[PDB]
Amino acid sequence: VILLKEGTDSSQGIPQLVSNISACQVIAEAVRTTLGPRGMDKLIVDGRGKATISNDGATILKLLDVVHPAAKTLVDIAKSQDAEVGDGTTSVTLLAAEFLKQVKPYVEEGLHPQIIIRAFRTATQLAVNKIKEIAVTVKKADKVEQRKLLEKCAMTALSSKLISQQKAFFAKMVVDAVMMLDDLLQLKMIGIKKVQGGALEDSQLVAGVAFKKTFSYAGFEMQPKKYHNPKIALLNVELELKAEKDNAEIRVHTVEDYQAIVDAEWNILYDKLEKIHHSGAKVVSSKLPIGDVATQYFADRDMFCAGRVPEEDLKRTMMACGGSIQTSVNALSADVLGRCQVFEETQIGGERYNFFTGCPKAKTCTFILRGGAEQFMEETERSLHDAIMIVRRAIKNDSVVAGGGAIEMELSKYLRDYSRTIPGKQQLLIGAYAKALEIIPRQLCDNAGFDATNILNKLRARHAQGGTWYGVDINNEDIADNFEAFVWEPAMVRINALTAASEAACLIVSVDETIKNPR
Amino acid sequence: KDQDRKSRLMGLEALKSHIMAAKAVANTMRTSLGPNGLDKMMVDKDGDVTVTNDGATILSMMDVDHQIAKLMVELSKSQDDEIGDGTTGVVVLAGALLEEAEQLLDRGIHPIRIADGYEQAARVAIEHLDKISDSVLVDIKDTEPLIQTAKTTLGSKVVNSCHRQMAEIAVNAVLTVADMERRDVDFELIKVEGKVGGRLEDTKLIKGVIVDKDFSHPQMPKKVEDAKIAILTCPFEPPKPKTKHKLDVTSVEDYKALQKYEKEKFEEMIQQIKETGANLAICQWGFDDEANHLLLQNNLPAVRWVGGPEIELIAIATGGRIVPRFSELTAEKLGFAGLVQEISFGTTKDKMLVIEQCKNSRAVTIFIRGGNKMIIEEAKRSLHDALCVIRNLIRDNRVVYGGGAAEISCALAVSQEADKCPTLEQYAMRAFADALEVIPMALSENSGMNPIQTMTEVRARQVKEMNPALGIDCLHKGTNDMKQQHVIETLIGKKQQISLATQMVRMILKIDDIRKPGES
Numbered sequence A: 001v002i003l004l005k006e007g008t009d010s011s012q013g014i015p016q017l018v019s020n021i022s023a024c025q026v027i028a029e030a031v032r033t034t035l036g037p038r039g040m041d042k043l044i045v046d047g048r049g050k051a052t053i054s055n056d057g058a059t060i061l062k063l064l065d066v067v068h069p070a071a072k073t074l075v076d077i078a079k080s081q082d083a084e085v086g087d088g089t090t091s092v093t094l095l096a097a098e099f100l101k102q103v104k105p106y107v108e109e110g111l112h113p114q115i116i117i118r119a120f121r122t123a124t125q126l127a128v129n130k131i132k133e134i135a136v137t138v139k140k141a142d143k144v145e146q147r148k149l150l151e152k153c154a155m156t157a158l159s160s161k162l163i164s165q166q167k168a169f170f171a172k173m174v175v176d177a178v179m180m181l182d183d184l185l186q187l188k189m190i191g192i193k194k195v196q197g198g199a200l201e202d203s204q205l206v207a208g209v210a211f212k213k214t215f216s217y218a219g220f221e222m223q224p225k226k227y228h229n230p231k232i233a234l235l236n237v238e239l240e241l242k243a244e245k246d247n248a249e250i251r252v253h254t255v256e257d258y259q260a261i262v263d264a265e266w267n268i269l270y271d272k273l274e275k276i277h278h279s280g281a282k283v284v285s286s287k288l289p290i291g292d293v294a295t296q297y298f299a300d301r302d303m304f305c306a307g308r309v310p311e312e313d314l315k316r317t318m319m320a321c322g323g324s325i326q327t328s329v330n331a332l333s334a335d336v337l338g339r340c341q342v343f344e345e346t347q348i349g350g351e352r353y354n355f356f357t358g359c360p361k362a363k364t365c366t367f368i369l370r371g372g373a374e375q376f377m378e379e380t381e382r383s384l385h386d387a388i389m390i391v392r393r394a395i396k397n398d399s400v401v402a403g404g405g406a407i408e409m410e411l412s413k414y415l416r417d418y419s420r421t422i423p424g425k426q427q428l429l430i431g432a433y434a435k436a437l438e439i440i441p442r443q444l445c446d447n448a449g450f451d452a453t454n455i456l457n458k459l460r461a462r463h464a465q466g467g468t469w470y471g472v473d474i475n476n477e478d479i480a481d482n483f484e485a486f487v488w489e490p491a492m493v494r495i496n497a498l499t500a501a502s503e504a505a506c507l508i509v510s511v512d513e514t515i516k517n518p519r
Numbered sequence B: 001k002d003q004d005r006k007s008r009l010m011g012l013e014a015l016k017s018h019i020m021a022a023k024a025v026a027n028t029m030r031t032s033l034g035p036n037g038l039d040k041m042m043v044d045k046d047g048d049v050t051v052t053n054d055g056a057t058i059l060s061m062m063d064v065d066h067q068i069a070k071l072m073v074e075l076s077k078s079q080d081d082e083i084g085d086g087t088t089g090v091v092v093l094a095g096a097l098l099e100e101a102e103q104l105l106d107r108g109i110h111p112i113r114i115a116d117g118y119e120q121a122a123r124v125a126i127e128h129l130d131k132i133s134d135s136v137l138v139d140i141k142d143t144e145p146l147i148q149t150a151k152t153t154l155g156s157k158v159v160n161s162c163h164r165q166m167a168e169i170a171v172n173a174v175l176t177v178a179d180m181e182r183r184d185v186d187f188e189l190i191k192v193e194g195k196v197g198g199r200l201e202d203t204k205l206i207k208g209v210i211v212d213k214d215f216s217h218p219q220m221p222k223k224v225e226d227a228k229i230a231i232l233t234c235p236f237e238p239p240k241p242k243t244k245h246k247l248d249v250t251s252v253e254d255y256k257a258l259q260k261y262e263k264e265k266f267e268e269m270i271q272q273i274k275e276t277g278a279n280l281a282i283c284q285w286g287f288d289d290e291a292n293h294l295l296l297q298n299n300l301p302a303v304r305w306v307g308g309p310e311i312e313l314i315a316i317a318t319g320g321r322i323v324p325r326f327s328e329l330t331a332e333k334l335g336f337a338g339l340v341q342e343i344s345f346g347t348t349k350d351k352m353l354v355i356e357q358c359k360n361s362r363a364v365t366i367f368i369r370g371g372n373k374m375i376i377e378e379a380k381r382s383l384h385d386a387l388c389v390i391r392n393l394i395r396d397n398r399v400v401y402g403g404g405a406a407e408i409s410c411a412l413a414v415s416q417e418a419d420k421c422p423t424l425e426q427y428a429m430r431a432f433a434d435a436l437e438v439i440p441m442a443l444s445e446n447s448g449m450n451p452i453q454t455m456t457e458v459r460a461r462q463v464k465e466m467n468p469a470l471g472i473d474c475l476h477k478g479t480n481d482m483k484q485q486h487v488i489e490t491l492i493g494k495k496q497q498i499s500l501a502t503q504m505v506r507m508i509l510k511i512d513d514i515r516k517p518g519e520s
C-alpha cells in the first residue's frame, strides 16, 4: 500500500530511447512532403473554424503544438533557426529525425547512446571544414555584372510556374526591388499587393508604399492627387457624421438646446477635422472608415483623405515616411507627420490606389500583381517571395555552395570515405551518419513526383566519377550541375543547419529517463 | 496545447478522403445541370421553405463541415461575377476531374504530376476555344442580336413565359451606366427592387433612383419637372431630436409662448427652401400637420420617413449631398432630376417615389413585379445572370456554342494533343478529356435520355459529318446543332469555367493532411 511513484510517470533504459526516437519521426512526417519548391501543402484549422493553407515549415510547427516532451525539443530549434539565419525550419526538422532512424537498430543491439553522441560531434565537426573547402566565392567571376547574375538564379526558381513564360519580366523586377533597399536587407521591407484583373504583363513595381485602398465612400471630382511635398498623417480616428464611437446624446426637454445638441454632435466631428487643418496634413490616412461629410471638408480646403487603411500598411507607411502613428488628433503635429516627393491616385486595375514615392526613409517597396484570379496571385506572391530570398542571400553571402542535394551527396561521400579509415565504434555510426544525410536529395525526388530510386542511383554514380556540384533538377527528370544552372545556397546556412540538426539529434539521444511531477 | 481529441488524416487514404469529400458535392449538383435541372428543397433554420435549382444558392446555403467541401464554397465568391451561368458546371467539372484522378491515384502517380498535367491540358482547351469562337459585334455596335442571346439565358428558369420584354430591359440598363467602347460595366450602378402584385409584363425601366416612400401629404403635387432637390436629415419644421421630442408645457402661459415660438420656426424653414431655389425637400423624418398646410400653398412637395440607406442611394444618382441642417443649404449640393412622380399599384398603399432623369444617366434601377414574393427574388437573380452575359459580350464579342458543343470539341483536341506528351503527365491529359465529356453527358441525363447513347452520336457528328461542332438536344427540339436553336455561351464564361475547375483540383490534390482539434 506504500508506493514510491503514486502517479509518477517515469521510465528509463533502452526502450525509453526507442520510444523517444519513434516519437521524433511523427514531427518529421508532418513536414516531410513540404520540402522543395514543388512540395505539398498542409491544411490546419484552428479552434474558430478558419482553415489555413500553407506549405511553409515554420507555419506548420507553430500550429502543431504536440504535448509530447521529445516533440517540444524540435520546436525551439525551429525558433532558434529563425534567429540564427532566418529560415530553414523544415530542413533541420527532417534532418534531425533521420539521424535517429539510422541509429535506431544500433541502440537495440546493446550499443550505448553516449558512443553515438561522440560520433555525432565528430562527423559534424568534419562537415564544417568540408563545406568551407568546396565553397567557392563568386563575386566578379568571368567579368559579368552582379545584376545579370541575380536575374539568372531567380529565373530557375520561378521556372515551371504560372509565370514561367514571362519569367524574363519578373526576374528584372525582383532584383531592382532589393537594389532599392539599403545594406540592411530584410524580407519584411518589400511588401506584395494583389490587384484583380488584367493579364500578367500589367504587373508594376511601386518604389514606395502602396495599399489596397478599399475606401469606397464618396469624395469624387475634387481633392487633387498631385502634391509636391505633402504631410503624411497616420490616424486611427473615425471621421463619420453618425459614427459608432463618436456621438453625443443629451436628454433635455427644451427646444432651444435641441439645435445645440445636434451642433455639439457635429462639433465632435468638426473639431477633429479642424486639428488636421492646423497641422497642415495634406493627406489623411485613417484605419476607421471616413464618412461622406469629412470628404467634403478636405475638398474645399485643398487636401486629400482616404480611410479604411489596414494597420499593417500603416506601419509600413510609418517606416517609409519616418513619422509616427498617432491615434488621437490633438497630438497631431510635425513630429509624427511624414513627407514624400510624388503622391498620386492611380487607376491600375480599374480601382483607385494610393502610393507615395520619394520618401526620405524609403526603405520599403510594394509589388503589384495582375491576374485573373486571387489564388493565381496568392501562389505568385509566395513564388516571388521565394525569388527575393535567393537574390537576398546572394548579396549578403558570397561564399555559396551548390543546392539541390549536391552538397548533401558530396558530404555523404566524404564521410563514408573517412569512416573506412577509422577503427572502432566510430565506423558504423559515422557511416550511418553519411547515409542519413541522403534524405535531402531523396525527399526532393519524392515531393517532385519523380522516381526516387532512378535518380539517386544515377546521382551517386555521378559523384563517384568526380562530380562535386551535381544534384536533382525540379524541372527535368534527370540530374544536372546545379552550379552551372545557378541553383545556389550560401555556405553559412548549410553549416548552421548541420550544427542545429546534430544538436537536436544529440539532445534526444542524451535523454534516457523522463521525470514527471504529479500536479 | 490540445493534442488530445484531434482528428488526423495522413497517408494515401487522406488523398481518397478528400476525393470523397468532393465527390459528394458533385453528385448532388450533376442532376441540377442545364435547363432541365431538378429542383432542390431548402429547409431554412427557422422553418421557411424556398425551392430552387440555381447553383449559387446551393453553395451559399450548404452548411458543410469538411474543409475540402468548404473549399468548394470558396469558389462561389469569385465565379458569380465572372461567368454567372456555369455555377453548376464548374462543380461537376471539378468533381469528375477527381473521379478519373481517383483512378490515376490507384496507379501510384503523385498529385503534383496530376495538378501540373491538368494545367497542361487546360491551356490546350483554352487555346482550342479561341480557334472555334465566332464574333458577333466586330467593328460595329448593335442591339438586335444581344436581346436574342439574352432571351436564352433568361428563359432557363420559370420566367420563360415573359422572357421577351425583360431581355430588352437589361440591354438598355447596361448601355446607360456603361459604354460599349469603354468596356467597364459596373454591377453596383444597376439596382433591382420589386413589390408583390401584378404580372411580369409590368416591368418598367426607371432611369434613376426609386425609394418606397410617399409624399408628406396626399394633396402634394405628383410631378416635379425642375431639377432642384434638397436632401436633408432634419425636416423643415421646429427642431426635433432623433428619437423623442418630449416638449414640456406647464400652463397656458407656456403653451401660448411656445406656439408663437414654433410659428416662427414654421414660417422660417419653410420659406428657407425658396431662398436657395429647391423644389423637393427629401428629409429623413416626416412633417407635421401645420407644415403640410404651408407646403401646399407655396407648391413645394416633400418626402417623409426616408430611411438610412435610402438617403445615400438618392444623392449618388441625382448628384446631391447629405446636408445636416438648414444652415448649410447651398445650390451646389441640390439634386437634379427630370421627373419625380409617385406611382401606386392598385389598392396597395405603398406609393413609392419614382425619381427619373429622362436622359442618359449613370445609375439605373429596375422594378420587377410578380404574383408571389418568391418569384420576385427569383427574377432578380434571373436578371442578374443576364447582366453578366451582356457584360461578357462587351469585353469580348467572340462567343462559342454552348450546350455541350464546346465541351465535345474541346475533348477531341485535348485527346489529340495528349499523344504528343511523352511523360507521366500524358495520363493527366487523357483524364482531362474524359472529365470534359461529363458536362454534356449530365445534360442528356437530366433530359431523360440515355447519357452514353446521346454523347457518342455527337462524336460521329463532330468528326465525320462536319468540323463545326453540334450541340446536344436538351430542350427536346427537332434536331441537333443548337447554333440554329440560338443557344450560345460566352467565350470568357467558357474559358474561366475551365480555369477555375483546374484551380480547385490543384488545391485539393496538393492538400494531403488535415488536423482538426476538438473540444477539451
Ligand SMILES: Nc1ncnc2c1ncn2[C@@H]1O[C@H](COP(=O)(O)OP(=O)(O)OP(=O)(O)O)[C@@H](O)[C@H]1O
Binding pocket: A034, A035, A036, A037, A039, A087, A088, A089, A090, A091, A092, A156, A157, A403, A404, A405, A440, A444, A472, A473, A474, A487, A489
Ligand atoms: N530551384 C531549386 N532547384 C533545385 N533544388 C532546390 C531549389 N530550391 C531549393 N532547392 C533545394 O530544396 C531544399 C530546401 O527545400 P525547401 O525550400 O522546401 O526548404 P527551405 O524553405 O529551404 O528550408 P529552410 O527554410 O529551413 O531553409 C534545399 O536543400 C535545396 O537544395
Ligand SMILES: Nc1ncnc2c1ncn2[C@@H]1O[C@H](COP(=O)(O)OP(=O)(O)OP(=O)(O)O)[C@@H](O)[C@H]1O
Binding pocket: B032, B033, B034, B035, B037, B053, B054, B055, B056, B057, B084, B085, B086, B087, B088, B089, B152, B156, B385, B402, B403, B404, B443, B472, B473, B474, B475, B482, B487, B489
Ligand atoms: N436551351 C438549352 N439547351 C441546351 N443546353 C442549354 C440550354 N440552355 C442552357 N444550356 C446549358 O446549360 C448550362 C447551364 O446549366 P444550369 O442552368 O444548371 O446552370 P445555371 O443555373 O445557369 O448557373 P447559375 O446557378 O450560375 O445560374 C450552360 O452551360 C448551357 O450550355
